[PDB]
Amino acid sequence: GLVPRGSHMSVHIGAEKGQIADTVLLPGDPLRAKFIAETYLENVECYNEVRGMYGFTGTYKGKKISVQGTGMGVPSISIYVNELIQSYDVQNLIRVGSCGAIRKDVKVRDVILAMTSSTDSQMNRVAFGSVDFAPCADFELLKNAYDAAKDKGVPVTVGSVFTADQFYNDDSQIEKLAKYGVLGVEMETTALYTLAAKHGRKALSILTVSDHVLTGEETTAEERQTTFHDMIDVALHSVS
Amino acid sequence: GLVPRGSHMSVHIGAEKGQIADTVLLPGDPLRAKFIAETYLENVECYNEVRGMYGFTGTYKGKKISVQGTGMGVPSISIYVNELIQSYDVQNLIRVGSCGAIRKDVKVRDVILAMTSSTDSQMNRVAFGSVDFAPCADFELLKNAYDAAKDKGVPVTVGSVFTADQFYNDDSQIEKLAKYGVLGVEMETTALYTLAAKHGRKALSILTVSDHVLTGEETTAEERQTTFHDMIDVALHSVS
Amino acid sequence: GLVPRGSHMSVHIGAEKGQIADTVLLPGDPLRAKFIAETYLENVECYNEVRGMYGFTGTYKGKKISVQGTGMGVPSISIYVNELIQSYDVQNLIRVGSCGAIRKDVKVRDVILAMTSSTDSQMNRVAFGSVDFAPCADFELLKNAYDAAKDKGVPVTVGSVFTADQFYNDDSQIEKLAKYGVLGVEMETTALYTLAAKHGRKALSILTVSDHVLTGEETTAEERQTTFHDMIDVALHSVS
Amino acid sequence: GLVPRGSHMSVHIGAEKGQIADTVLLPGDPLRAKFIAETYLENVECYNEVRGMYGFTGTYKGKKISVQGTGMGVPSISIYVNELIQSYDVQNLIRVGSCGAIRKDVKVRDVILAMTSSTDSQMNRVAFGSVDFAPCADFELLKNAYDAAKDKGVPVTVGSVFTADQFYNDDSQIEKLAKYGVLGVEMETTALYTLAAKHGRKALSILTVSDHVLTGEETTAEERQTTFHDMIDVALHSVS
Amino acid sequence: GLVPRGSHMSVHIGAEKGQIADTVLLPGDPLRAKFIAETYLENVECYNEVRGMYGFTGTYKGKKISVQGTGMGVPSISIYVNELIQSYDVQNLIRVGSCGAIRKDVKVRDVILAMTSSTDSQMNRVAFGSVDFAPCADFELLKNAYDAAKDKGVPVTVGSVFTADQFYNDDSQIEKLAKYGVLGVEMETTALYTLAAKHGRKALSILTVSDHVLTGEETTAEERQTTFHDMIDVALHSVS
Amino acid sequence: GLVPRGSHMSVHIGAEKGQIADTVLLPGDPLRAKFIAETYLENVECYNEVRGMYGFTGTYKGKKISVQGTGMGVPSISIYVNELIQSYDVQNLIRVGSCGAIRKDVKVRDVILAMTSSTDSQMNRVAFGSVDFAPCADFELLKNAYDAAKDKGVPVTVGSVFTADQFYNDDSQIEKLAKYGVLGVEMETTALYTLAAKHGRKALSILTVSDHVLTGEETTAEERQTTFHDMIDVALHSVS
């Protein structure tokens, strides 16, 4: 190929049978996938370079864990999640990413566990028409993560998020969503939760606050990096 | 009035401030409201008879608790939940009701805790248009309920439900909903969860299975009554 | 059961074959069902106590008439109307209820006969998708009611209503509906008219004004009660 | 102009103030407008030739009546009805046209009076969004027409119709519409009823059967023409 | 018939096979169809008088060309285009009409070639539901028209238009459409392009400016008539 | 930062304003952006490494050109296009990518120029509601591309495409879209064309066939690489 190609079984992932673990962390940024795998895992290998969307496999306290970049937005993560599920038999899928907080009571240091997500994606209206489908986290994964946070005293907030198609949106309804108690905005959760459930696999999204969208309250690198480490510790402890 | 009238502040509830507790159990059937209050609570008073939609307040373990029938469907529960929240300052709202199970893996003895609900009600499209709003349980209540169930060894399943407008529906999508992991069908949760969140109150729906919609298999009175009691016990332990 | 159970053939109505008349009046309030049956009919029997949603049968000038509370909202009346039609072979279904007036020209003393109803329920979009279905009264019933009113001099207005899902609605379009000539808001007619037509039965909604929703002009008990009497007289004279 | 031009106040009608009566019959075919005016009215003048969409004014038993072709479809009739209402102060608008019957029980000789109409036009969703708006005939006009038919012994049916955007429609739902009681299909009524009501004017559609859509039962010229004459006689008598 | 009838094969066109050319110009105004045929073509015959929607066939530099009025709006043109395509085997369909300009940069003398059209017609949502279908001109016709205009120095602008259902529309989104680059508003192109494409025929809409919608800046007869002649010259040269 | 960060002015592009050209080629795959820049351009520098979404700038025959990976799907390309337009004042935006052909008449060697795109993205319904917005290519770029292809003898097809949200879609309407003349499926064009038009910039999507969706017929490496090189050659000649 002119550039790396996927496998016949997975057009966007150039891996073979067995190279991807049953449990996969899913950051949006493939360079964060790299950073996570190299910083937290042992015996790391890169199994995918197709489209520069790096995927890695290594071990955490003897258990195989993969870390796969998803890109941004429902259509991008849907491609990777479908291929992970259908071609690599992945069982547990945990997004680890950022969100923009939309309520003042959402604190910079809180690790957010998404129970569900609202969206302006049409993906579920395409499937259900007049039905509003509410995606749902796997409770076992969510509870294990909450327990991992609580056991250490890591601040954790459990609620809902909004999965946006338009990062830049002149027609945003973030103010109203915040009034209805939605915690923050990201670009992946609705797809991860819907596709995992449709195929009987377990999904969870863990998120940290990268900014406060409505107040412009600033975040610092120290705050963001500490909370990021807590997020990855929670994700890994919860599956251990 | 020709029949009992609501109060000026609450057109559908004939009570006065203080007569309803800050925690209210919400069965759909006002005769189950009566049964619950008289069976489980002490020193019970009926504070509402408007439209025969009985509401009661009594004592459980040193606190006042109320039990208010809601009727069936999003529009009916919305009227009672709005009035309880806005006129009686209710803080914790816990639906206790039945659902039709739509998956083989949902057992007759399972107490269901709804994380979220899908719907064919237009109530959220009316507010949000192109946005699919995903209603969300209060996790504090949900986790307390889960912990109460686990403490006794009551079987508990945590996931999503479908809030139907049409109990009889030629255009039902319950097969597809079940494929997407939805546990069962009921007629209230979307409204309870959306309105509680909009007003910063805490809600949870606890459900027991009254029938298996897709396999057709019937429940026994012994199965239903056992699980009903388990649901009420769990409910009475959902608020810290 | 712990509380009254429906019959096998009608989950929400605990009656047997023959106990319900072929002509049924449908107030929303089951206590008004009781008031109507006991005040206007002879030899009254209560055939349903399931969910406290009382239904009665008696005679009016030798004709059997039933009066069945429906509860509030499209989902609730849909349950009762489906069971009445499919399980008890009911032929004539006449709602007798209240509405909030939305036009200054609608007088508190006018009995309203609904030709059709607009709605924000999704029930018909669930069935028809891109089609806007316009529910339609049975003209024979409507004509007979109009003639009954005119023969005595009872004030009568014929036009359309709006069937709301949300009695409390921050996103109401009642101002625009009034500009388009809609008379008032209630919570049942769309379902009654659509379901009766689907099954080839005759329906009509007769309504009286409980409130002036936009002008804030209040109604008195004397006005409401006289007009209620006129409504029931029109319903019964019209079927005689 | 290269061809006849509308007036400054009415882009599609080349008339002056006063040339159009306050009561206007609205056939879809401008040649039927000519036929009706010439055959039924005295001292006929043609007030419009713009776009060949003929409009005429004459007298029937001394009352001024106009007959204006509308063309086919919601957008075409909307142009004429808006201009008639807004620029010529028209008060009573009565469509006289054809429909395709969609029920076996609709008889070829029955004159149809439309109480309301369903549609697949987006015109009302454009205005109301999540609301299904149900257009409504003026009851005074409808009742006058019904009484004129009964007085003259003309067979008459009253019910609802469907206003189609697509005369040829691979995605038609007319079989389902017929099951819900809809009598026939035409292409104008939703716009006439909605726009007349929006401006506080009176409208009615009277229709005769030109075709049996679902059965291909045949109609004859003699049947069609006799019933057409009945329709026009009903329209004119109802207005005098 | 009381007035002219269509043929059995084409309900709205009273012609026989062979009488209509494989290339048809489609003005909305049948009097403009007449003007075009009589002014530009030789040996003209009128093949249709049904509903006064005149169609003509003649020759231009020896080539058979038909000119068929369409009426206004998606439903009217859809009737004529369906019949032309399905009953008369028409291959090339070129609308020649007017539009209201919605941008300052669209000049009164510019001949507009529409690449595509937006709409508020539901015709494509009826077919595709959640999909936004974008109708597309045949590029060969478009390029031939472009080349014909350039050859003479006739000013030409290529871009998109908006096909409106409501010429008079209180809920218009013209301002937003102009911001997204849409050139003008007309009432036919979406239907023409969609139906031509569905049947593998070639379509193009050529348009001239009759009005500036947002500024009320005036056009004169001399401007409109000169540009009209340019439009017909481009259409005919382009098929020569 | 833990990984590369965007500029304050462009959250997802870590470049200084002067590092990006006024003309940007937009492949979905950032490794194809690398290949394009290294293969075709002189004096190449990489200006972005944020999220591994590489962007490069060099010269082609003396003209400054950038090549920026967009990722897959409307939300991803919308981020990059908004930042290019708003923060780097990019004027010409040309997607160079793959599509799945959906018609037998689309040949493997055909370079496709998209005039417009349909979609199942909700992005335009979010903005326009009841309006179907049809995105439009810049005709100047399209015509230059067409002219360049013809000059070289590269087979070119001009028509419409479908912008999918779901690469894997159980509810796909590909068969119907092909019937309506749509050429192929990709995941970016609607966003590119909509956002460029909204901001008065010029856009075009050029596409090559990666496979035949509906016949399973595969392409070969030699076919794909030949046509890729044709596409880039054409693109490098689309700006006037």
Side-chain angles (χ1 to χ4, degrees), chain F residues 133-173:
Chain F
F133 178 73
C136 189
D138 180 72
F139 182 73
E140 177 184 348
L141 298 183
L142 193 143
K143 193 204 162 211
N144 287 344
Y146 178 77
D147 287 348
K150 293 302 202 171
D151 283 348
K152 282 146 175 171
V154 168
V156 56
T157 299
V158 180
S160 67
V161 299
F162 175 73
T163 295
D165 268 2
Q166 289 191 87
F167 185 96
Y168 299 105
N169 184 5
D170 273 4
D171 302 294
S172 178
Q173 300 190 71

Side-chain angles (χ1 to χ4, degrees), chain D residues 28-30 48-55 68-71 76 80, chain E residues 53:
Chain D
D29 180 351
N48 185 54
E49 287 166 15
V50 176
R51 291 164 178 275
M53 193 60 74
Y54 307 121
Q68 175 58 64
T70 62
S76 185
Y80 298 102
Chain E
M53 193 57 81

Side-chain angles (χ1 to χ4, degrees), chain D residues 3 12 29-31 49 51-52 54 72 75-76 80 82-83 120 122 127 165 168 170-171 187 198 221 228, chain E residues 2-3 5 12 29-31 49 51-52 54 72 75-76 80 82-83 120 122 127 165 168 170-171 198 228:
Chain D
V3 294
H12 302 84
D29 180 351
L31 304 182
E49 287 166 15
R51 291 164 178 275
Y54 307 121
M72 305 179 286
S76 185
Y80 298 102
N82 274 301
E83 294 182 14
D120 64 356
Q122 226 184 179
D165 264 5
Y168 301 103
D170 275 0
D171 302 296
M187 295 183 66
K198 187 179 187 286
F228 176 81
Chain E
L2 297 182
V3 294
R5 298 174 169 151
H12 302 85
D29 180 349
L31 303 185
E49 293 180 358
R51 294 168 179 271
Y54 305 127
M72 301 181 288
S76 186
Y80 295 103
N82 272 305
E83 291 180 16
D120 65 354
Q122 221 183 185
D165 266 2
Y168 300 106
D170 278 0
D171 303 296
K198 187 174 166 83
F228 178 80

Side-chain angles (χ1 to χ4, degrees), chain C residues 108-113 145-158 206-208 226-235 237:
Chain C
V108 71
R109 290 289 292 276
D110 283 343
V111 173
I112 295 165
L113 304 178
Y146 180 79
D147 290 344
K150 292 286 169 195
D151 282 355
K152 298 295 187 175
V154 172
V156 60
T157 286
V158 184
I206 307 182
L207 302 159
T208 64
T226 299
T227 312
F228 176 80
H229 177 53
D230 285 346
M231 163 168 74
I232 300 307
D233 283 335
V234 165
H237 292 164

Side-chain angles (χ1 to χ4, degrees), chain D residues 70-196:
Chain D
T70 62
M72 305 179 286
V74 162
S76 185
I77 184 167
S78 292
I79 280 164
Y80 298 102
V81 168
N82 274 301
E83 294 182 14
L84 289 170
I85 290 176
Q86 301 201 70
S87 297
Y88 300 90
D89 201 39
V90 171
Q91 296 301 307
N92 308 297
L93 299 103
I94 301 177
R95 161 161 167 75
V96 286
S98 65
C99 70
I102 65 174
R103 289 176 56 89
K104 282 164 203 151
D105 69 358
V106 169
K107 303 306 177 202
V108 68
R109 300 286 308 271
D110 286 333
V111 175
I112 294 163
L113 305 178
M115 294 165 65
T116 186
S117 54
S118 295
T119 194
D120 64 356
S121 177
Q122 226 184 179
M123 66 167 285
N124 291 323
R125 292 190 191 191
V126 158
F128 288 102
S130 290
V131 159
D132 281 356
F133 179 75
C136 185
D138 180 75
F139 184 73
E140 179 183 0
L141 294 189
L142 189 148
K143 185 208 162 28
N144 289 344
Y146 176 81
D147 287 350
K150 284 270 134 47
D151 281 344
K152 282 90 204 175
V154 172
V156 61
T157 285
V158 186
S160 67
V161 299
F162 174 69
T163 294
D165 264 5
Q166 287 191 90
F167 185 93
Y168 301 103
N169 185 4
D170 275 0
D171 302 296
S172 186
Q173 295 190 74
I174 59 167
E175 300 198 326
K176 191 180 211 160
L177 287 157
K179 182 182 97 211
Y180 279 63
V182 181
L183 304 176
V185 187
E186 49 95 77
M187 295 183 66
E188 290 80 17
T189 292
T190 288
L192 174 59
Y193 282 12
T194 296
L195 295 177

Side-chain angles (χ1 to χ4, degrees), chain E residues 98-120:
Chain E
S98 65
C99 70
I102 64 175
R103 288 178 58 94
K104 286 164 170 168
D105 61 10
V106 170
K107 305 307 181 183
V108 296
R109 299 278 301 269
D110 286 335
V111 172
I112 298 180
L113 303 182
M115 296 176 60
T116 187
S117 55
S118 291
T119 194
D120 65 354

